Amino acid sequence: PVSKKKFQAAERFLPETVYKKEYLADLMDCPHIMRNVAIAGHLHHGKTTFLDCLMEQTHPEFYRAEDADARFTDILFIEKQRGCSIKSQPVSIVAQD
Amino acid sequence: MTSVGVPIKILHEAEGHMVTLETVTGEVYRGKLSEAEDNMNCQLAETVVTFRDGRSHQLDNVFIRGNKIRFMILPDMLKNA
Amino acid sequence: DSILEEKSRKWKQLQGKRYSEKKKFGMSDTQKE
Amino acid sequence: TISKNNKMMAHLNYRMKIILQDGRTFIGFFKAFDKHMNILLAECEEHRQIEEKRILGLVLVRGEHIVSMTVDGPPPRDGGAGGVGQAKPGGRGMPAMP
Amino acid sequence: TAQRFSNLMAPTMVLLGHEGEIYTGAFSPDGTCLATSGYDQKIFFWNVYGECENFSTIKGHSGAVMDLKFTTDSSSLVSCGTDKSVRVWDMETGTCARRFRTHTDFVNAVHPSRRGVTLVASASDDGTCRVHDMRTKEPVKTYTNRYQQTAVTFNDSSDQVISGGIDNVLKVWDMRRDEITYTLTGHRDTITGISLSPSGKFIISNSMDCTVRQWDIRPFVPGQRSVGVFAGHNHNFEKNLLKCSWSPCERFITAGSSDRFLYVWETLSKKIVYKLPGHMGSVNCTDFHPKEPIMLSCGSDKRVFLGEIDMS
Amino acid sequence: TANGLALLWAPRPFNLRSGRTRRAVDVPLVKSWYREHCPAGMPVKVRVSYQKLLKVFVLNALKHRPPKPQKRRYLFRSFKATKFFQTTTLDWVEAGL
Amino acid sequence: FKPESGPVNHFKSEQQRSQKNTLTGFVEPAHLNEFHFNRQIRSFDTLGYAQNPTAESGTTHFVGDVKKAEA
Amino acid sequence: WFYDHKPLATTRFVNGPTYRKWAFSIPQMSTLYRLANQLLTDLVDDNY
RNA sequence: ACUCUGGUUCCUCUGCAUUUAACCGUGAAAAUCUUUCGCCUUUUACUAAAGAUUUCCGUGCAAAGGAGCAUACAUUGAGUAAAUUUUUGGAGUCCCCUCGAGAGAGCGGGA
Ligand SMILES: Nc1nc2c(ncn2[C@@H]2O[C@H](COP(=O)(O)OP(=O)(O)OP(=O)(O)O)[C@@H](O)[C@H]2O)c(=O)[nH]1
């Protein structure tokens, strides 16, 4: 019955963040602040590991191994195994200038 | 930046939003705080000025010298910040 | 009162030895030297 | 009170009544201050002498204009580990007697 | 079917989790909780009702705990132990609000003031009876006796401190005089515990001579203060400081006993009517729940018993 | 500095400088040799032996199963706890004999 | 506690009438202050007397060469 | 110290006689790296 | 202003090491059940692969207690210590008109 269909990581809870979720959801009402961005690269340039640094700063609980990239935005298990990114994934975070 | 006090930090988070500030001469300015400074100079845009007699007028931009501002009503989401 | 002096002495030894730090709970995992 | 760190952290979040040099009375939950004695009042209201009450938002008062402030009301308000023992129901075994 | 008398889940409960010999146990005055401790040094809190789960446990003691009493408002638990220290535990935080440390030898017995400023009477193997105050490092009063003191209580007005000890006779000190106002004489061996009546008129005192003696501590009595003597319990060669306690209606008195039996006496007749087996060793402490007819007993058998009775 | 930079791409363990310590039975001194490839010149016997050692390594890695979390059965501590066993320091040829 | 009413046998006198559970005796678990129990062995062995272990010991507080206990 | 039985165990480079952790410098690490050479691979491995 | 503790090392106990892409182990054994090839006048012991389960050699961290070696009170968790334009060194007082018994307010006027 408990079919092991799992093909992607999905988090069992909301992880901790430095910002309150309420301040994120309130800032959503204010496009005079918010920005949208895409990060685009040749294969295996910085792009995914750089977002892991933005994750590590906002989250505190975000474990990065000393040996290998965590690659949080590479959620699929094919992307974990291949380690190239294969599909886009979005992040939303509050961050200070 | 250097560690300026929390009220000045909250003032810069108020830059996105509408703020309402009263000047020492009594006029109330409501507008969208486009720049603020650590001396709390304020630049407002899309401004409405309300005079002490209750008349009002629109103003496209206003610069208020920081030491002439009595108080500002900030938006509530900044309480979360 | 001299009997109370003796009883005071007896009580001091008994409670001293009973509670003694060498005998408190959580002790004598004794190392096989 | 303020600046004495053990004391200052407890005087924040009190509901405080602020008197300004124009004679206004503001009331709100005082929850930030600055070396220039600027103060930030959450959920603020004003009382103007004539008394009339008006509701404001989060109000930043530039410190230059404060005369004085006083406590109006308390901050809002709302071991834990064990589990070693167990407590099943039972009964009393009768011992021996002489 | 059978008669029931309390909200207990069963007419007796066996509480297991201790490993040390349990030397003391008391209910919270609100009736929600009880706390128990002894040679394990860990103070175990238990709920009175339902599964009675051990919701909290406080460490921090490093010498075994002689005696343990709640403050009247139930905000704090006061406990003392052979670490020469008196420790006051905040009930909400579970942390040591005060650690009085001026005793020079084992502290065996503790009693908080009933009302006014929170004061803690304490008695010790250094022979001093000391009253501490939450507000000061130094104690308010130190009364020194030549012989070790192992029981203490205030009176209800919290202005006389009654301390008993090796002397068998009782040094009762009046806190405005700093003198013994009177002594209570009848005990042939050391006094293992004293408990003040709910109304404050009387105290019971338990002693190693295997009797509990009831004393009238009211300001005027026209003759001898000995009201009565209770017997039937026993003190064994362990020489424990077996405690005693009052029923909140005063009609019943209890004392610890080395014969494993939970004794209850009727105050006027001094007869026994409850002799409750179930323990496997010396019953060091016994107390009544303050609102409901539940008996607590703590024993050297590492077990705590809760049970309900027909208090008549 | 020149040596420190060279260590960064030394083979493991030499790219570390701080490490947990490992049992002498676990250091498999020759294992990198059979992993990498046969040298072009080595004859029949040795080439076949490289394939057989890869087969053993590939079956070991394929089957694996991660270790169970358990209470470790310390058994020599259980002997040492009883009165019947004593401990002493001995010379390996004495202990062997 | 109230005692069983009526006569008691002449058939089965002072050993056999007593309370028992195992074949000779009432056996029940006990816990004590180990250290004090250790003390009471050592006094009986070295000195000839001990403080009476029994529950409900009554007046018989001590058990041994009572002349030594009093002296 | 190279041929001691448990080398360095009584020194600041390893936690103690349980011999569970080590922290060598670079002068040490480059020297034993150079001695190990005959056993080691040449590769910047992963692509090969 | 408060309770709170000596370093280091070692022993033993207790808890957790299931979200496995993957890994408590940069190493790598054995057994059982079920299933599929090859030896055999018989069974074990076997060949070599899969799946499900165990055992065994190890492992990590945290906490607790104790025991040993050289010895020191600070300090952890809980909290202190600048008069020249934008705040913390007075552009402040007084004297008229208005509403109102009263005392304040009007981008009020003026010395
Ligand atoms: N040397 C070095 N390598 C890095 C650095 N940052 C990332 N890399 C390596 O480059 C590889 C790819 O990193 P990723 O974050 O997956 O790069 P990527 O571009 O997101 O991969 P794709 O987006 O799929 O192309 C990994 O092996 C990283 O270790 C770096 O700062 N220095």
Side-chain angles (χ1 to χ4, degrees):
Chain A
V2 184
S3 63
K4 213 285 184 168
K5 288 188 175 184
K6 302 290 290 194
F7 61 84
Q8 72 192 346
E11 216 66 29
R12 303 190 166 211
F13 304 98
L14 285 178
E16 185 164 310
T17 46
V18 168
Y19 54 88
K20 303 194 83 194
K21 311 305 184 190
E22 298 172 303
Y23 188 51
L24 177 140
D26 293 338
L27 279 166
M28 288 174 70
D29 293 346
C30 191
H32 290 273
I33 292 189
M34 95 181 73
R35 300 297 191 257
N36 302 311
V37 191
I39 278 166
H42 195 215
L43 170 70
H44 301 315
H45 293 189
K47 40 155 215 298
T48 310
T49 307
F50 189 92
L51 279 90
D52 299 343
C53 297
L54 303 182
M55 288 298 300
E56 188 181 334
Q57 289 161 28
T58 55
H59 293 66
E61 300 287 62
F62 181 75
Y63 171 77
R64 289 210 291 165
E66 300 179 21
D67 299 300
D69 309 81
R71 296 184 299 113
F72 177 80
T73 52
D74 289 353
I75 68 165
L76 305 174
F77 291 176
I78 192 178
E79 296 174 313
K80 295 304 192 181
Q81 288 170 99
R82 281 285 189 206
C84 62
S85 303
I86 292 165
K87 302 193 195 171
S88 55
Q89 282 297 318
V91 167
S92 294
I93 49 172
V94 187
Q96 286 74 34
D97 77 355
Chain B
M1 289 307 194
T2 298
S3 193
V4 72
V6 172
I8 301 303
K9 295 187 178 184
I10 293 293
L11 180 61
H12 302 328
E13 305 190 80
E15 287 182 15
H17 306 96
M18 299 294 290
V19 304
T20 306
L21 65 91
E22 182 171 307
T23 58
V24 293
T25 52
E27 295 96 312
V28 178
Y29 293 82
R30 175 173 178 84
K32 191 169 291 186
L33 180 64
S34 64
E35 307 265 18
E37 299 187 353
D38 60 352
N39 57 48
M40 87 197 293
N41 287 333
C42 293
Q43 306 191 26
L44 303 184
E46 200 66 18
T47 335
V48 177
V49 55
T50 298
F51 305 104
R52 222 179 196 278
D53 60 17
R55 292 178 295 136
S56 302
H57 200 281
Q58 291 184 344
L59 299 170
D60 53 354
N61 287 104
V62 187
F63 196 111
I64 306 100
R65 177 177 166 104
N67 90 303
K68 308 289 180 181
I69 302 178
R70 189 172 279 147
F71 67 90
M72 314 194 216
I73 299 154
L74 305 182
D76 294 336
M77 63 216 283
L78 299 180
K79 102 197 171 183
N80 301 325
Chain C
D1 300 1
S2 57
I3 278 62
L4 302 182
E5 239 76 31
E6 164 65 359
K7 189 156 66 183
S8 172
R9 179 168 58 192
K10 266 172 164 56
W11 186 265
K12 193 177 179 181
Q13 294 184 5
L14 257 62
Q15 305 310 335
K17 285 181 172 288
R18 178 176 183 160
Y19 298 114
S20 186
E21 290 292 339
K22 299 183 173 71
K23 301 297 174 184
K24 65 175 174 283
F25 180 88
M27 189 162 186
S28 301
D29 291 345
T30 313
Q31 185 175 167
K32 180 154 284 180
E33 279 162 306
Chain D
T1 59
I2 309 301
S3 303
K4 292 284 188 174
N5 201 4
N6 170 256
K7 311 306 178 196
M8 172 268 282
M9 72 188 289
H11 287 73
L12 291 169
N13 312 295
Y14 266 85
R15 183 175 160 98
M16 295 199 76
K17 181 176 188 180
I18 281 62
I19 302 97
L20 301 184
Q21 285 191 343
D22 64 350
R24 282 182 163 113
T25 296
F26 284 175
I27 312 185
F29 292 88
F30 161 65
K31 79 176 196 170
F33 83 108
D34 188 19
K35 70 174 187 176
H36 317 96
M37 324 94 164
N38 300 311
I39 56 96
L40 187 71
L41 302 184
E43 293 160 34
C44 188
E45 298 171 291
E46 68 168 314
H47 294 266
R48 298 188 188 177
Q49 300 194 132
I50 300 179
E51 190 169 47
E52 177 180 320
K53 193 186 72 162
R54 174 177 173 233
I55 302 170
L56 308 181
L58 176 66
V59 175
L60 170 57
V61 178
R62 177 177 172 93
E64 191 171 354
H65 310 289
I66 297 165
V67 178
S68 185
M69 64 190 73
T70 184
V71 172
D72 184 49
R77 297 179 179 155
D78 297 341
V84 182
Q86 294 187 346
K88 63 181 180 182
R92 293 176 167 268
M94 181 63 171
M97 283 84 68
Chain E
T1 193
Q3 187 63 50
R4 290 300 308 283
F5 307 94
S6 81
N7 295 341
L8 288 174
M9 187 160 70
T12 283
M13 308 298 292
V14 183
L15 278 53
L16 303 176
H18 280 284
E19 180 176 351
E21 302 164 23
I22 313 174
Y23 287 12
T24 185
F27 290 100
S28 62
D30 65 6
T32 61
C33 161
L34 63 144
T36 60
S37 195
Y39 203 83
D40 45 21
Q41 299 166 3
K42 299 185 179 178
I43 300 171
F44 278 57
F45 296 82
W46 315 81
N47 282 328
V48 178
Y49 303 114
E51 184 59 20
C52 303
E53 64 283 345
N54 179 221
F55 69 89
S56 180
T57 295
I58 285 180
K59 299 178 179 175
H61 273 290
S62 64
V65 182
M66 307 302 286
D67 196 5
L68 172 151
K69 296 300 200 309
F70 282 84
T71 54
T72 312
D73 58 12
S74 197
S75 62
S76 299
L77 182 80
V78 187
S79 70
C80 71
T82 60
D83 55 17
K84 308 186 177 190
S85 301
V86 186
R87 285 169 157 273
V88 186
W89 311 101
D90 182 275
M91 283 295 299
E92 279 69 51
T93 318
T95 200
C96 199
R98 287 291 283 107
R99 179 182 173 182
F100 309 110
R101 63 175 70 94
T102 56
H103 278 293
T104 65
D105 212 343
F106 299 162
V107 190
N108 56 197
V110 74
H111 186 255
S113 58
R114 281 185 169 187
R115 68 188 72 88
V117 292
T118 297
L119 302 175
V120 175
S122 62
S124 170
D125 303 334
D126 58 21
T128 73
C129 184
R130 280 179 155 120
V131 178
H132 308 282
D133 181 349
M134 301 297 288
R135 301 174 296 174
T136 57
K137 290 187 180 182
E138 194 71 5
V140 186
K141 299 299 187 175
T142 297
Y143 300 129
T144 58
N145 189 49
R146 181 173 167 185
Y147 312 122
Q148 296 95 315
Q149 301 292 275
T150 65
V152 73
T153 184
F154 289 113
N155 66 342
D156 175 81
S157 50
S158 307
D159 69 327
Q160 296 194 112
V161 194
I162 301 100
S163 72
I166 284 187
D167 353 40
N168 334 307
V169 189
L170 297 80
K171 318 296 177 167
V172 181
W173 303 90
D174 186 357
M175 293 174 60
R176 68 190 54 79
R177 305 186 196 213
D178 299 328
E179 292 187 314
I180 295 175
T181 47
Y182 55 87
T183 63
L184 305 160
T185 57
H187 290 291
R188 277 71 161 191
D189 209 357
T190 88
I191 294 147
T192 63
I194 300 166
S195 184
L196 179 71
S197 55
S199 66
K201 302 183 195 190
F202 312 108
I203 64 180
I204 51 181
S205 57
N206 192 5
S207 169
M208 300 198 169
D209 73 2
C210 310
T211 69
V212 195
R213 300 184 195 264
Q214 178 187 353
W215 306 98
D216 196 346
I217 65 152
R218 290 180 286 187
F220 179 76
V221 178
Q224 193 178 24
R225 290 181 177 268
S226 184
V227 182
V229 182
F230 308 83
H233 71 275
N234 205 41
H235 294 60
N236 67 182
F237 52 81
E238 312 187 342
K239 284 189 183 286
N240 294 347
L241 309 183
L242 308 186
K243 308 303 180 190
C244 55
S245 189
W246 292 85
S247 176
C249 69
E250 281 185 21
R251 295 192 294 280
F252 307 103
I253 281 158
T254 54
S257 189
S258 295
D259 65 0
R260 310 172 173 210
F261 297 113
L262 311 184
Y263 282 90
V264 181
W265 302 264
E266 180 178 45
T267 303
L268 184 61
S269 69
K270 298 154 287 184
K271 295 179 182 180
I272 300 144
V273 57
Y274 238 108
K275 196 172 167 188
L276 245 171
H279 279 285
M280 296 170 287
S282 293
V283 182
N284 297 312
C285 189
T286 292
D287 202 11
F288 292 88
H289 184 283
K291 296 177 174 178
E292 200 163 15
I294 299 168
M295 278 258 61
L296 166 61
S297 61
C298 298
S300 189
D301 53 3
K302 313 177 171 71
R303 297 195 176 190
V304 179
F305 276 73
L306 293 171
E308 66 180 41
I309 59 173
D310 182 25
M311 295 201 300
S312 64
Chain F
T1 302
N3 297 334
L5 286 165
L7 288 166
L8 285 167
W9 296 283
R12 187 181 176 94
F14 293 97
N15 67 353
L16 312 179
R17 60 149 289 228
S18 304
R20 301 201 70 81
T21 58
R22 212 182 173 206
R23 301 182 295 161
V25 314
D26 290 330
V27 185
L29 294 154
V30 302
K31 182 174 181 180
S32 55
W33 304 350
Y34 72 76
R35 280 188 70 229
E36 76 183 28
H37 264 153
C38 297
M42 60 160 44
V44 180
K45 287 183 178 181
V46 198
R47 278 184 149 105
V48 172
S49 75
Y50 273 61
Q51 290 178 267
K52 285 184 181 178
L53 291 180
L54 280 174
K55 198 178 74 173
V56 175
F57 172 33
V58 175
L59 290 172
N60 279 162
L62 177 64
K63 296 184 304 180
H64 193 185
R65 297 179 176 263
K68 294 171 190 167
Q70 296 186 324
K71 290 194 181 193
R72 181 57 245 157
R73 278 184 168 216
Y74 273 129
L75 177 76
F76 286 4
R77 305 190 181 190
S78 85
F79 293 168
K80 195 169 68 169
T82 183
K83 67 188 293 193
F84 305 102
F85 285 83
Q86 297 304 336
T87 62
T88 198
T89 299
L90 273 197
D91 175 315
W92 185 92
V93 180
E94 191 162 25
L97 285 170
Chain G
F1 286 75
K2 183 171 169 176
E4 288 170 28
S5 188
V8 75
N9 312 51
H10 43 82
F11 271 91
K12 307 186 181 184
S13 65
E14 190 63 24
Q15 291 181 192
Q16 190 167 15
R17 296 165 193 153
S18 290
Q19 178 71 331
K20 81 181 184 297
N21 185 40
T22 79
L23 181 72
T24 67
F26 201 94
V27 176
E28 62 192 334
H31 302 84
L32 293 175
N33 199 245
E34 172 87 54
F35 161 60
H36 270 139
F37 156 76
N38 275 285
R39 184 171 154 105
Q40 303 300 333
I41 287 194
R42 285 161 186 193
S43 53
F44 204 101
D45 288 353
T46 59
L47 317 180
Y49 58 89
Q51 191 180 328
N52 192 355
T54 55
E56 309 196 53
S57 59
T59 188
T60 320
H61 283 110
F62 246 86
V63 290
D65 193 3
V66 70
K67 293 186 177 181
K68 297 182 71 183
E70 295 190 332
Chain H
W1 57 254
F2 191 59
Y3 292 121
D4 293 348
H5 170 42
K6 287 177 171 177
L8 304 175
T10 54
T11 76
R12 70 176 186 90
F13 299 105
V14 28
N15 71 280
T18 335
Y19 209 73
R20 292 295 194 166
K21 292 189 297 188
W22 58 273
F24 289 177
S25 60
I26 304 307
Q28 289 168 344
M29 281 306 299
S30 59
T31 302
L32 16 81
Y33 176 32
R34 202 188 75 246
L35 294 167
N37 272 343
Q38 297 294 344
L39 303 181
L40 294 181
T41 184
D42 294 323
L43 302 171
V44 286
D45 22 358
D46 300 334
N47 294 332
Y48 165 99

Coordinates of all heavy atoms in Angstrom, one line a residue, chain E residues 2-27:
Chain E
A2 N -19.2 -0.9 42.9 CA -18.7 -0.6 44.2 C -18.7 0.9 44.4 O -18.8 1.7 43.4 CB -17.3 -1.1 44.4
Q3 N -18.6 1.4 45.6 CA -18.6 2.8 45.9 C -17.3 3.4 45.5 O -16.2 2.8 45.5 CB -18.8 3.0 47.5 CG -18.9 4.4 47.9 CD -20.2 5.1 47.4 OE1 -21.3 4.5 47.5 NE2 -20.0 6.3 46.8
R4 N -17.4 4.7 45.0 CA -16.3 5.5 44.6 C -16.3 6.8 45.4 O -17.4 7.2 45.8 CB -16.2 5.7 43.1 CG -16.0 4.5 42.2 CD -14.6 3.9 42.5 NE -13.5 4.9 42.4 CZ -13.0 5.4 41.3 NH1 -13.3 4.9 40.1 NH2 -12.0 6.3 41.5
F5 N -15.2 7.4 45.6 CA -15.1 8.6 46.3 C -14.2 9.7 45.7 O -14.1 10.8 46.3 CB -14.5 8.4 47.7 CG -15.1 7.3 48.5 CD1 -14.7 6.0 48.4 CD2 -16.2 7.6 49.3 CE1 -15.3 5.0 49.2 CE2 -16.8 6.6 50.0 CZ -16.4 5.3 50.0
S6 N -13.6 9.5 44.6 CA -12.7 10.5 44.0 C -12.7 10.4 42.5 O -13.2 9.4 41.9 CB -11.3 10.4 44.5 OG -10.6 9.4 43.8
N7 N -12.2 11.4 41.8 CA -11.9 11.4 40.4 C -10.7 10.6 40.0 O -10.3 10.7 38.8 CB -11.8 12.8 39.9 CG -13.1 13.6 40.0 OD1 -14.2 13.0 40.2 ND2 -13.0 14.9 40.0
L8 N -10.1 9.8 40.9 CA -9.0 8.9 40.5 C -9.6 7.8 39.5 O -10.7 7.5 39.5 CB -8.5 8.1 41.7 CG -7.6 8.9 42.7 CD1 -7.3 8.0 43.9 CD2 -6.3 9.4 42.0
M9 N -8.7 7.4 38.6 CA -9.1 6.4 37.6 C -9.3 5.0 38.2 O -10.0 4.2 37.6 CB -8.0 6.3 36.5 CG -8.4 5.4 35.3 SD -7.4 5.7 33.9 CE -5.8 5.1 34.3
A10 N -8.7 4.7 39.3 CA -8.9 3.5 40.1 C -8.8 3.7 41.5 O -8.0 4.6 41.9 CB -8.0 2.4 39.6
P11 N -9.5 3.0 42.4 CA -9.4 3.4 43.9 C -8.1 3.2 44.5 O -7.9 3.6 45.7 CB -10.4 2.4 44.5 CG -11.2 1.8 43.4 CD -10.4 1.9 42.2
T12 N -7.0 2.7 43.8 CA -5.7 2.9 44.2 C -4.8 2.9 42.9 O -5.2 2.2 41.9 CB -5.2 1.8 45.2 OG1 -5.8 2.1 46.5 CG2 -3.7 1.6 45.3
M13 N -3.7 3.6 43.0 CA -2.8 3.8 41.9 C -1.4 3.4 42.4 O -1.0 3.8 43.5 CB -2.8 5.2 41.3 CG -4.2 5.7 41.0 SD -5.0 4.7 39.7 CE -4.0 5.1 38.2
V14 N -0.6 2.8 41.5 CA 0.8 2.5 41.8 C 1.6 3.3 40.8 O 1.5 3.1 39.6 CB 1.1 1.0 41.7 CG1 2.6 0.7 42.1 CG2 0.2 0.2 42.6
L15 N 2.5 4.2 41.4 CA 3.3 5.1 40.6 C 4.7 4.5 40.6 O 5.3 4.4 41.6 CB 3.3 6.5 41.1 CG 2.1 7.4 40.8 CD1 0.7 6.7 41.0 CD2 2.1 8.6 41.5
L16 N 5.3 4.3 39.4 CA 6.5 3.6 39.2 C 7.4 4.6 38.3 O 6.9 5.1 37.4 CB 6.4 2.3 38.5 CG 5.5 1.2 39.1 CD1 5.5 0.0 38.1 CD2 6.0 0.7 40.5
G17 N 8.6 4.7 38.7 CA 9.6 5.5 38.0 C 10.8 5.9 38.8 O 11.9 6.1 38.3
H18 N 10.5 6.1 40.1 CA 11.6 6.4 41.0 C 12.6 5.2 41.0 O 12.2 4.0 40.7 CB 11.0 6.5 42.4 CG 10.5 7.9 42.7 ND1 11.3 9.0 42.9 CD2 9.2 8.4 42.6 CE1 10.5 10.0 43.1 NE2 9.3 9.7 42.9
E19 N 13.8 5.4 41.3 CA 14.8 4.4 41.7 C 15.3 4.6 43.1 O 15.7 3.7 43.8 CB 15.9 4.2 40.7 CG 16.9 3.1 41.0 CD 18.0 2.9 40.0 OE1 17.9 3.5 38.9 OE2 18.9 2.1 40.2
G20 N 15.4 5.8 43.5 CA 15.8 6.2 44.9 C 14.7 5.9 45.9 O 13.6 5.8 45.6
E21 N 15.2 5.8 47.2 CA 14.3 5.7 48.3 C 13.5 7.0 48.5 O 14.2 8.0 48.8 CB 15.0 5.3 49.6 CG 15.8 4.0 49.5 CD 16.8 3.9 50.7 OE1 16.5 4.6 51.7 OE2 17.7 3.1 50.5
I22 N 12.2 7.0 48.4 CA 11.4 8.2 48.4 C 11.2 8.7 49.8 O 10.5 8.0 50.6 CB 10.1 8.0 47.7 CG1 10.3 7.3 46.3 CG2 9.4 9.4 47.4 CD1 9.0 6.9 45.7
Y23 N 11.7 9.8 50.2 CA 11.8 10.4 51.5 C 10.7 11.5 51.8 O 10.6 11.9 52.9 CB 13.2 10.9 51.8 CG 14.3 9.9 52.1 CD1 14.1 8.6 51.8 CD2 15.5 10.3 52.5 CE1 15.1 7.7 52.0 CE2 16.5 9.4 52.7 CZ 16.3 8.1 52.4 OH 17.3 7.2 52.6
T24 N 10.0 12.0 50.7 CA 9.1 13.0 50.9 C 8.1 13.1 49.8 O 8.5 12.8 48.6 CB 9.8 14.4 51.1 OG1 8.9 15.4 51.4 CG2 10.7 14.7 50.0
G25 N 6.9 13.6 50.1 CA 6.0 13.9 49.0 C 4.8 14.7 49.5 O 4.3 14.5 50.6
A26 N 4.3 15.6 48.7 CA 3.3 16.6 49.0 C 2.5 16.9 47.8 O 3.0 16.9 46.7 CB 4.0 17.8 49.6
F27 N 1.2 17.3 48.0 CA 0.4 17.8 47.0 C 0.5 19.3 46.8 O 0.8 20.0 47.8 CB -1.1 17.5 47.3 CG -1.5 16.1 47.3 CD1 -1.6 15.3 48.4 CD2 -1.8 15.5 46.0 CE1 -2.0 14.0 48.3 CE2 -2.2 14.2 45.9 CZ -2.3 13.5 47.1

